[PDB]
Design a protein around this ligand. Sequence first.
Ligand SMILES: [K+]
Ligand SMILES: [K+]
Ligand SMILES: [K+]
Ligand SMILES: [K+]
Ligand SMILES: [K+]
Ligand SMILES: [K+]
Ligand SMILES: [K+]
Ligand SMILES: [K+]
Ligand SMILES: [K+]
Ligand SMILES: [K+]
Ligand SMILES: [K+]
Ligand SMILES: [K+]
Ligand SMILES: [K+]
Ligand SMILES: [K+]
Ligand SMILES: [K+]
Ligand SMILES: [K+]
Ligand SMILES: [K+]
Ligand SMILES: [K+]
Ligand SMILES: [K+]
Ligand SMILES: [K+]
Ligand SMILES: [K+]
Ligand SMILES: [K+]
Ligand SMILES: [K+]
Ligand SMILES: [Mg+2]
Ligand SMILES: [Mg+2]
Ligand SMILES: [Mg+2]
Ligand SMILES: [Mg+2]
Ligand SMILES: [Mg+2]
Ligand SMILES: [Mg+2]
Ligand SMILES: [Mg+2]
Ligand SMILES: [Mg+2]
Ligand SMILES: [Mg+2]
Ligand SMILES: [Mg+2]
Ligand SMILES: [Mg+2]
Ligand SMILES: [Mg+2]
Ligand SMILES: [Mg+2]
Ligand SMILES: [Mg+2]
Ligand SMILES: [Mg+2]
Ligand SMILES: [Mg+2]
Ligand SMILES: [Mg+2]
Ligand SMILES: [Mg+2]
Ligand SMILES: [Mg+2]
Ligand SMILES: [Mg+2]
Ligand SMILES: [Mg+2]
Ligand SMILES: [Mg+2]
Ligand SMILES: [Mg+2]
Ligand SMILES: [Mg+2]
Ligand SMILES: [Mg+2]
Ligand SMILES: [Mg+2]
Ligand SMILES: [Mg+2]
Ligand SMILES: [Mg+2]
Ligand SMILES: [Mg+2]
Ligand SMILES: [Mg+2]
Ligand SMILES: [Mg+2]
Ligand SMILES: [Mg+2]
Ligand SMILES: [Mg+2]
Ligand SMILES: [Mg+2]
Ligand SMILES: [Mg+2]
Ligand SMILES: [Mg+2]
Ligand SMILES: [Mg+2]
Ligand SMILES: [Mg+2]
Ligand SMILES: [Mg+2]
Ligand SMILES: [Mg+2]
Ligand SMILES: [Mg+2]
Ligand SMILES: [Mg+2]
Ligand SMILES: [Mg+2]
Ligand SMILES: [Mg+2]
Ligand SMILES: [Mg+2]
Ligand SMILES: [Mg+2]
Ligand SMILES: [Mg+2]
Ligand SMILES: [Mg+2]
Ligand SMILES: [Mg+2]
Ligand SMILES: [Mg+2]
Ligand SMILES: [Mg+2]
Ligand SMILES: [Mg+2]
Ligand SMILES: [Mg+2]
Ligand SMILES: [Mg+2]
Ligand SMILES: [Mg+2]
Ligand SMILES: [Mg+2]
Ligand SMILES: [Mg+2]
Ligand SMILES: [Mg+2]
Ligand SMILES: [Mg+2]
Ligand SMILES: [Mg+2]
Ligand SMILES: [Mg+2]
Ligand SMILES: [Mg+2]
Ligand SMILES: [Mg+2]
Ligand SMILES: [Mg+2]
Ligand SMILES: [Mg+2]
Ligand SMILES: [Mg+2]
Ligand SMILES: [Mg+2]
Ligand SMILES: [Mg+2]
Ligand SMILES: [Mg+2]
Ligand SMILES: [Mg+2]
Ligand SMILES: [Mg+2]
Ligand SMILES: [Mg+2]
Ligand SMILES: [Mg+2]
Ligand SMILES: [Mg+2]
Ligand SMILES: [Mg+2]
Ligand SMILES: [Mg+2]
Ligand SMILES: [Mg+2]
Ligand SMILES: [Mg+2]
Ligand SMILES: [Mg+2]
Ligand SMILES: [Mg+2]
Ligand SMILES: [Mg+2]
Ligand SMILES: [Mg+2]
Ligand SMILES: [Mg+2]
Ligand SMILES: [Mg+2]
Ligand SMILES: [Mg+2]
Ligand SMILES: [Mg+2]
Ligand SMILES: [Mg+2]
Ligand SMILES: [Mg+2]
Length: 85
Amino acid sequence: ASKKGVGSTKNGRDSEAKRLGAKRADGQFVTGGSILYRQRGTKIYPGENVGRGGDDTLFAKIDGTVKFERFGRDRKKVSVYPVAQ
RNA sequence: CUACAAGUAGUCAGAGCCCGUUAACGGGUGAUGGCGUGCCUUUUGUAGAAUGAACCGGCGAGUUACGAUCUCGUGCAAGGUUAAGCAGAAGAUGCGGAGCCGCAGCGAAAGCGAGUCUGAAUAGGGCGCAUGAGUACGUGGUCGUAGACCCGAAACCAGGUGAUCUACCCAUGUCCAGGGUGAAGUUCAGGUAACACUGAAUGGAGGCCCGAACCCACGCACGUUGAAAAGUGCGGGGAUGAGGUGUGGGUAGGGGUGAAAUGCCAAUCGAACCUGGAGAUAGCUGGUUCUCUCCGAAAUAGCUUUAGGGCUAGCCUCAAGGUAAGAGUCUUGGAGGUAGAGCACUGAUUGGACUAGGGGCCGGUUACCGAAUUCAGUCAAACUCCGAAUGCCAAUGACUUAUCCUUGGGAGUCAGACUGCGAGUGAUAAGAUCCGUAGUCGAAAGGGAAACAGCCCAGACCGCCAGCUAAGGUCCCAAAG
RNA sequence: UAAGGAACUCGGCAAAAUGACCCCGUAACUUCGGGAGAAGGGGUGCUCUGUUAGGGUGCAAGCCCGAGAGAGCCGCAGUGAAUAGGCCCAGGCGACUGUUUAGCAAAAACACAGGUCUCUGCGAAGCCGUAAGGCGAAGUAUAGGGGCUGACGCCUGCCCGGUGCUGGAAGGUUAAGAGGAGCGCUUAGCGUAAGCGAAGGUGCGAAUUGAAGCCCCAGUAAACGGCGGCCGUAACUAUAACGGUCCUAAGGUAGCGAAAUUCCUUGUCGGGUAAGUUCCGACCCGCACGAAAGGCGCAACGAUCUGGGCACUGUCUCAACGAGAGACUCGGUGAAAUUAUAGUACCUGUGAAGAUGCAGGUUACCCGCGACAGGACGGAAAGACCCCGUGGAGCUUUACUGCAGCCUGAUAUUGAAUGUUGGUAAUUGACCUUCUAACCCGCCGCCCUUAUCGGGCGGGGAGACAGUGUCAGGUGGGCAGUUUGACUGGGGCGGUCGCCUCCUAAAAGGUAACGGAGGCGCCCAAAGGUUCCCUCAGAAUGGUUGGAAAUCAUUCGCAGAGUGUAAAGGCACAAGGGAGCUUGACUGCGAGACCUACAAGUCGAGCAGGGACGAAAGUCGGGCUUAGUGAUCCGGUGGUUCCGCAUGGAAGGGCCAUCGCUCAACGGAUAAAAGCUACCCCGGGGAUAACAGGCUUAUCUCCCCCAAGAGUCCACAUCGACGGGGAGGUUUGGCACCUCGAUGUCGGCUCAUCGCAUCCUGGGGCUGUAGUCGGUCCCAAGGGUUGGGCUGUUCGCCCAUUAAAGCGGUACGCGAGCUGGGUUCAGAACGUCGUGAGACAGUUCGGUCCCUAUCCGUCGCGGGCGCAGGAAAUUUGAGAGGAGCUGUCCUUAGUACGAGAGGACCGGGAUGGACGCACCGCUGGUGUACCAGUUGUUCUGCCAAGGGCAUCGCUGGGUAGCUAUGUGCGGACGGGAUAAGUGCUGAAAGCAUCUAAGCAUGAAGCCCCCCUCAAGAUGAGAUUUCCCAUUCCGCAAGGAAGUAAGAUCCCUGAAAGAUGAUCAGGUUGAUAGGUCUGAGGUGGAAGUGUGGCGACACAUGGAGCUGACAGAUACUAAUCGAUCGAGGACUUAAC
RNA sequence: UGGUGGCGAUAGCGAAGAGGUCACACCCGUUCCCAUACCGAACACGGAAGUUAAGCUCUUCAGCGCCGAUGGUAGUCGGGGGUUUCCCCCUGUGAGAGUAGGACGCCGCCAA
RNA sequence: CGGGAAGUAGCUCAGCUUGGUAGAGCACAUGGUUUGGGACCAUGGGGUCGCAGGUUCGAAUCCUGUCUUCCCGACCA
RNA sequence: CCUCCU
Ligand SMILES: [K+]
Ligand SMILES: [K+]
Ligand SMILES: [K+]
Ligand SMILES: [K+]
Ligand SMILES: [K+]
Ligand SMILES: [K+]
Ligand SMILES: [K+]
Ligand SMILES: [K+]
Ligand SMILES: [K+]
Ligand SMILES: [K+]
Ligand SMILES: [K+]
Ligand SMILES: [K+]
Ligand SMILES: [K+]
Ligand SMILES: [K+]
Ligand SMILES: [K+]
Ligand SMILES: [K+]
Ligand SMILES: [K+]
Ligand SMILES: [K+]
Ligand SMILES: [K+]
Ligand SMILES: [K+]
Ligand SMILES: [K+]
Ligand SMILES: [K+]
Ligand SMILES: [K+]
Ligand SMILES: [Mg+2]
Ligand SMILES: [Mg+2]
Ligand SMILES: [Mg+2]
Ligand SMILES: [Mg+2]
Ligand SMILES: [Mg+2]
Ligand SMILES: [Mg+2]
Ligand SMILES: [Mg+2]
Ligand SMILES: [Mg+2]
Ligand SMILES: [Mg+2]
Ligand SMILES: [Mg+2]
Ligand SMILES: [Mg+2]
Ligand SMILES: [Mg+2]
Ligand SMILES: [Mg+2]
Ligand SMILES: [Mg+2]
Ligand SMILES: [Mg+2]
Ligand SMILES: [Mg+2]
Ligand SMILES: [Mg+2]
Ligand SMILES: [Mg+2]
Ligand SMILES: [Mg+2]
Ligand SMILES: [Mg+2]
Ligand SMILES: [Mg+2]
Ligand SMILES: [Mg+2]
Ligand SMILES: [Mg+2]
Ligand SMILES: [Mg+2]
Ligand SMILES: [Mg+2]
Ligand SMILES: [Mg+2]
Ligand SMILES: [Mg+2]
Ligand SMILES: [Mg+2]
Ligand SMILES: [Mg+2]
Ligand SMILES: [Mg+2]
Ligand SMILES: [Mg+2]
Ligand SMILES: [Mg+2]
Ligand SMILES: [Mg+2]
Ligand SMILES: [Mg+2]
Ligand SMILES: [Mg+2]
Ligand SMILES: [Mg+2]
Ligand SMILES: [Mg+2]
Ligand SMILES: [Mg+2]
Ligand SMILES: [Mg+2]
Ligand SMILES: [Mg+2]
Ligand SMILES: [Mg+2]
Ligand SMILES: [Mg+2]
Ligand SMILES: [Mg+2]
Ligand SMILES: [Mg+2]
Ligand SMILES: [Mg+2]
Ligand SMILES: [Mg+2]
Ligand SMILES: [Mg+2]
Ligand SMILES: [Mg+2]
Ligand SMILES: [Mg+2]
Ligand SMILES: [Mg+2]
Ligand SMILES: [Mg+2]
Ligand SMILES: [Mg+2]
Ligand SMILES: [Mg+2]
Ligand SMILES: [Mg+2]
Ligand SMILES: [Mg+2]
Ligand SMILES: [Mg+2]
Ligand SMILES: [Mg+2]
Ligand SMILES: [Mg+2]
Ligand SMILES: [Mg+2]
Ligand SMILES: [Mg+2]
Ligand SMILES: [Mg+2]
Ligand SMILES: [Mg+2]
Ligand SMILES: [Mg+2]
Ligand SMILES: [Mg+2]
Ligand SMILES: [Mg+2]
Ligand SMILES: [Mg+2]
Ligand SMILES: [Mg+2]
Ligand SMILES: [Mg+2]
Ligand SMILES: [Mg+2]
Ligand SMILES: [Mg+2]
Ligand SMILES: [Mg+2]
Ligand SMILES: [Mg+2]
Ligand SMILES: [Mg+2]
Ligand SMILES: [Mg+2]
Ligand SMILES: [Mg+2]
Ligand SMILES: [Mg+2]
Ligand SMILES: [Mg+2]
Ligand SMILES: [Mg+2]
Ligand SMILES: [Mg+2]
Ligand SMILES: [Mg+2]
Ligand SMILES: [Mg+2]
Ligand SMILES: [Mg+2]
Ligand SMILES: [Mg+2]
Ligand SMILES: [Mg+2]
Ligand SMILES: [Mg+2]
Ligand SMILES: [Mg+2]
Ligand SMILES: [Mg+2]
Ligand SMILES: [Mg+2]
């Protein structure tokens, strides 16, 4: 039984998935430090009491409630507001 | 009971006949009717045209020791406990405190100590304390070291036994009916100056010829649970030789011997045989024995000289805790770029208008192509000016439901299958392959789809000669139009 | 064994033929021997002459051997039986006789004589052994060992670059051992401390010295090996003697060549054949010949291989008969493999995808006996193939690591002199030479001593060498232990392996494939930090050089740019551009998060220390973000309020910092690793390949749609592009679902059976159908469908036929049916590849084919019971099987048709081929209890006549029976209904219209007709005839007994037969034997006579003899017996 | 008017007008602080002769851009069916495009 | 079918690996030399690197595709 | 080194 020779692919590579995106929900309580969003670039901007890390990670600078919110016409931010106290 | 019957041999229904018991809504037999593809192993899936068992009987597989750890029990408890040994029934027990564990941790260590280490630090942080139980013994679960659940290699090494078979050799014997051919040499004759050379006779060479014994083994047939573990029959080859054969001897296994085939070395040879190391090792195959109950998987991820193995995680179970932390639905908020769609970007692309420019044809002209621009029009996994349904993450109560988490003991699983839906690979093939998602099978019997793991309906604790329905059905087989 | 004679087959395998002696005669070729038993022919008994000639023995007598003749005699035949070469032509291979895989290979393999290379000066080399001791060899270069080649003949070219071997040693490099310049630790002592530091001890240690080897220089190919491209060129073309150029150590000479080598390939041409994939001869595009792994020849030789002839034949056409051994029946004895239990049908389907057992149907009374193998994926053997195992073993090597051996140095044993030449002016190393006294002697004499051992003594030789010990370097598949990855739509081979980005990815996250695309293993001292300022691509227009595009100016300008680098996400309050100052490209950390099996990975506000920039606010722990990397162990370097084995130190460790991995197979097995196995083995797998099956149908085969064209015209007679749609499931595949505790695998043979897509024959439509022929389509599966050459072949080509030479399925139908050529083990060889061991759907020569049938199934044959009494016959036919083919000639008619050429339908008739049934009168075959001839020997005493054995001894005939090649006969003639087709009438639809109502016609096909079986046809049928209603038990229901008609046991047998069965008979009986008479067969008995010297001939006499054949005849045997076998249920209806 | 904010361009472009004592500009200088990879252009320091031409402020406008329903349609969760590369049905949900329409600014605080 | 290697002037070859320059021999052309050829001497010219696309400021050179011509492989069944 | 044919 004859078997035709076959070629090869020059593809077959991919990097590890980086588990990007939202890490806390709108309206969820977070502690200071909590990563809110992982991203390349600013898909979402740091709002009130939120920071942008060296790799564009958005994180809560205080304890409080996460609010994702429209930032002008085209953009989005995420903010953390203190609880009513 | 049985000669018109289609048989995993029963089971349920059932006359007839024959009986009469541990006296029971009894026993034997069984015309006929319905249903019904053994058991085990291994599998995605086995009635399997895969595996195992002729039958019956007996025998035949998680053990024990010493350590570790957990649960349970008991004694004592900030303590607990003795070992060897001595005495004593091979005993209990008494003595024996050496030793061991615990009561304090932190640090690599010096060391400090309810703290300590890091650090320049009264900082912060790590591990501890505060947040207190151990220890001795026993049973049980599991682990470790031992053959460690049982059976099974091919092999490896050590020490031996074999050349009464066979290989070659050594010493010493012996065998080979018959027939043929006619080398050298010699003689004689011829022959020449001598020799050459010629003829005839003689002579008896030879891994010479034909052919019995003997040895061999070329062809065919037969035989193939044989007359025979290599033969017989008919033919065949050698048959004075590198011959056959007897007796007595020699060479021995990491070795001999080989006119060389890895041949032969006692029916064994790519390394003999026997015993031992030895219960070698086997991530492999097979097997692993009483019952019922409660619960009940996986066939995945990651890493692996890894891919049919393993480990951690996932999923199961048991206990103790926490406890109500889980889940469904409604409501509310949010992240996100798929389906669709669109052309705003990138790329592809059709027609018209339009010409820069190029090409045929004279700085001049053409049915030849044309960039841009413009009008209209198509398309896209790696296009997006847009953008759902769902799914996901949460919050908030409400209505409902009972899960959920932690710690510890014990696993198994890492071959999956098909079906529907969304993709890739393929040829928009495969009962194909590879993901995603739901189901069923696996591990699920019952009804339907003739039969038919995976489809449709539906989850078997038992009994009933009750009833209602599901899918699918209602002329007869075959319940109901 | 008729006729034939290789047609058989892979192949003349097997068989047949040949065969003794004497004589004649005998070719090519040759190594002059051979070839040769070449070939091809002739003779062959017996009698007499004849106790021949002649010979041996002997005094003779005699005995023995014995040609060659002549004359006869007999037979079918005289080596009368048994035993006893077939031969020839040509080629390959090996020169030859030998040898070999005990037990699948006898060969082309091995050996061989011969050649050559090479080593070896004798304690030889080589080999065995640790050594002693040995072999070598009681040999000595004309000898011995090793490698290669393989008689003989002619020959044996080129390359020394590589590798090996040999020689060389000027230099380089290199060990132990010498050597000890320095340095460290320690501490007497000295120092307020810090430090310094004598001596000693101790730990390191540089220069220098140091052999062989290696590098290096040469040589060597009958050492290992190797021995080229491209382009141009001649006055026809073609080809290029000739030239150019690149490369090499050198480019393959002679010879041979489609080959044991040639893929393409059945090369081409010639020969041989009717036909030749093989064979021989040529040619040369030598895939991939080639000169001692020899080249080319070659007489002789071969159980060698190949091709062709003569002879010969049962090899075959195509089979028939006979003998014996089994088989079969009876008596005796009596295993085995296998086995889940089996009351064990068929079809189609289903299903783990190929069912006795499942479904639905169809069929089937119960039990055997002889037979056959289709199935039980039959038995046998835990598949040798293939894969897998971090399983083995054997083998290889420039795999790794070792070891033996060998070489080389140092040092000990080991001493004495002499010069010479290096540090050190007198002391120590190196070197050369000499000595003798160690050591050695496989030298001599003497002694122990009857001794080729050993020892002693004395000579001689050699000599501080050698040998040996220790240490060291080199060499070293000679030997040893091992390694030699995984993924993978089987494995190998190719590719890949970690990290980053995108898509696939189904709008969270995640998500596979040997899916689709790309990047990375860095870079930057600014391309980092901060402060301040800024805006890009491109276009248009103007303008020196200057263009399409340099720099300048204006205008337009969400970015069409840029962002170190891939991509994505981002970025114009810039994250893009510019400038100033800087080093936060910080140290200690770090609430809390993300990610996650772990190990790791990511983000982080904030705190402290000390800074950079900024007036300040503030920002800064590298870079727009996301790659740019690697665990542990081990080791190095720096630091250190740590440890420091009595103490002080130190050595060494710890801790912090940091360095060394294409550990890239990137979670890294080791510091250190490649191959072959067809000599292979074990554990496993249908988890995974090869055969067959299944799914699929790309490919394949077939059929269609559209209709552009072709066809003068004309798409559609015929063909049909571009495109489109299917069917089938015979191809190659894809997939990997059954089977690896075995599903034997190509072709052929034997036996078929099915489909129809039809090859022929039958029936038709259309035709570019005049006729005869055809083309094309439709119906049709009844029957039929050849023998050869070549090749293992399927296929194909060819020869010759034929009505035709169909295509497919059935596990590529059929190996428990056969074969075994091929494929597919072990041997050997060629080309080729490989350093090698070895390897090749390349080739070549050779190479073990097991099984007693249980079940179903198939073919035959019995027994049982049934079929409302028991019997004997004859039957109907539900139903089943069989058969089913076709040519040629004559005639119609040279008619129809046609210019002619040619030449029919339809219809008559005759006769064949192939096939089948029966049968032996005919022709033949066979004919083992028939007749005859004949050889040898042996027996019946001898002669004569006979018997036995030699294949039935052989040879010539042959009866019955059984038989084909022999004879006879068959498929005839028709009905019925139909297919395609043709219609008639006829409307729907005023017409038309084969159809809707109605009515026909019409195939080798369907149902009959013809032949056979058939009532288990459980639906058990019918007709005719026979027996006759018994007895006893019983309430009857039943039961028992003896019988009738009839049958059987037993017996004689054959027309029957494995056995049963069947049939003819069983005494008023011709059943068989015998007997008698015949037929046929043989061919002329014995005895006697006559003739002849005799072998023999003739007569008596178509005699004698004669299995199975015919008739007759109770002479013999079928004796006497016994056994079995009805008394007929009930109901209803008509009588 | 000026400053300074918040709100998705409904705020923007573009077009046509109107306005300036003060305020905001342009404007006029380079002695000084400071400045230009050259340039007092800009930045900086100073001034007030001029001017609303431009910026700025205020009107008007729907050409471009922006915002944008309702209905319908595509798609689709769930449930069924079929002639199954795909399609249909039913209770939900529901775009994009297109369009009606909106829109040439809305809301602060301070100073004058 | 799978894997390689080439492709540069008329012909044969370098250059490619390292991006910036198109070389070399023979041939060709012109002159000289010769009675005339040949040889010899002197002096010149000739591609845009197979084709297409890409990366780059820039491609014979780096990347891809394609075409042509060679070479190797196609094993176990 | 060569020197077309008659
Ligand atoms: K039953
Ligand atoms: K099996
Ligand atoms: K602390
Ligand atoms: K306790
Ligand atoms: K155990
Ligand atoms: K051996
Ligand atoms: K699925
Ligand atoms: K041999
Ligand atoms: K032949
Ligand atoms: K021969
Ligand atoms: K099965
Ligand atoms: K059978
Ligand atoms: K496959
Ligand atoms: K690895
Ligand atoms: K098969
Ligand atoms: K069709
Ligand atoms: K198998
Ligand atoms: K067989
Ligand atoms: K069989
Ligand atoms: K059976
Ligand atoms: K006859
Ligand atoms: K009957
Ligand atoms: K007579
Ligand atoms: Mg095949
Ligand atoms: Mg960074
Ligand atoms: Mg019946
Ligand atoms: Mg019955
Ligand atoms: Mg059935
Ligand atoms: Mg399976
Ligand atoms: Mg098994
Ligand atoms: Mg069994
Ligand atoms: Mg060993
Ligand atoms: Mg012995
Ligand atoms: Mg002996
Ligand atoms: Mg002889
Ligand atoms: Mg002989
Ligand atoms: Mg014999
Ligand atoms: Mg043996
Ligand atoms: Mg052991
Ligand atoms: Mg449960
Ligand atoms: Mg394994
Ligand atoms: Mg686990
Ligand atoms: Mg779409
Ligand atoms: Mg799966
Ligand atoms: Mg599948
Ligand atoms: Mg399972
Ligand atoms: Mg079920
Ligand atoms: Mg059922
Ligand atoms: Mg099951
Ligand atoms: Mg009913
Ligand atoms: Mg004959
Ligand atoms: Mg004859
Ligand atoms: Mg033949
Ligand atoms: Mg034949
Ligand atoms: Mg023969
Ligand atoms: Mg020979
Ligand atoms: Mg011989
Ligand atoms: Mg043998
Ligand atoms: Mg032998
Ligand atoms: Mg043999
Ligand atoms: Mg010796
Ligand atoms: Mg000797
Ligand atoms: Mg040889
Ligand atoms: Mg030879
Ligand atoms: Mg030579
Ligand atoms: Mg050769
Ligand atoms: Mg040679
Ligand atoms: Mg089943
Ligand atoms: Mg099926
Ligand atoms: Mg079936
Ligand atoms: Mg079975
Ligand atoms: Mg079997
Ligand atoms: Mg079986
Ligand atoms: Mg096996
Ligand atoms: Mg084998
Ligand atoms: Mg080895
Ligand atoms: Mg070992
Ligand atoms: Mg593998
Ligand atoms: Mg593969
Ligand atoms: Mg590879
Ligand atoms: Mg999703
Ligand atoms: Mg996602
Ligand atoms: Mg280690
Ligand atoms: Mg000390
Ligand atoms: Mg790895
Ligand atoms: Mg590893
Ligand atoms: Mg071999
Ligand atoms: Mg061998
Ligand atoms: Mg095996
Ligand atoms: Mg399978
Ligand atoms: Mg197959
Ligand atoms: Mg099968
Ligand atoms: Mg699969
Ligand atoms: Mg089996
Ligand atoms: Mg047909
Ligand atoms: Mg096939
Ligand atoms: Mg077959
Ligand atoms: Mg068979
Ligand atoms: Mg064979
Ligand atoms: Mg070679
Ligand atoms: Mg092979
Ligand atoms: Mg080959
Ligand atoms: Mg009938
Ligand atoms: Mg007769
Ligand atoms: Mg006859
Ligand atoms: Mg006589
Ligand atoms: Mg006798
Ligand atoms: Mg005798
Ligand atoms: Mg009857
Ligand atoms: Mg008689
Ligand atoms: Mg809308």
